[PDB]
Amino acid sequence: GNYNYRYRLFRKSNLKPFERDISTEIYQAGSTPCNGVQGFNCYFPLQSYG
Amino acid sequence: GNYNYRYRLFRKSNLKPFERDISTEIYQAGSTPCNGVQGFNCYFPLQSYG
């Protein structure tokens, strides 16, 4: 496995053309806040390719 | 996608029978002490099914 290449899997809105997103904030996919901790309905935005 | 189901992808050694590992420690896959922060050669142990 080469997990050094990552792609952003979760975002609130689509990107404008020629825009980059280097943020690492936890994507809240539920009603409960995440507080920067992964868990139930709180996911890391970047996933490795493998 | 249903990303609430996770599996442990990286571990130092294989598990014993009837043993569980709920620890969330950043697995170092290189020679760099990266202080528990994901990035190059430091991966999260848990990966989502999706």
Q: What is the N-to-C order of secondary-structure elements of chain A (H for helix, E for strand)?
A: EEEE
Biggest interchain interface, per-side counts = A-B, 10 and 12 residues
Give the N-to-C terminal Cα separation of chain A. 5 Å
- What's the β-strand tally of chain A? 4
- Enumerate how many helices of chain A there are, as a single number: 0
| % residues in beta strands of chain A | 15-25%
Query: What is the radius of gyration of chain A computed over CA atoms, rounded to a whole number of angstroms?
Result: 12 Å
Secondary structure category of chain A:
mainly beta
Largest sheet of chain A: 2 strands, antiparallel
Oligomer: part of a larger assembly
The helix fraction of chain A, in percent, is under 10%
* Strand order, largest beta sheet of chain A: 1-4
- Shape field of chain A: flat
Protein name (chains A, B): Spike protein S1
Region (Immunodominant HLA epitope recognized by the CD8+) (chains A, B): 2-10
Region (Receptor-binding motif) (chains A, B): 1-50
Disulfide bonds (chains A, B): 34-42
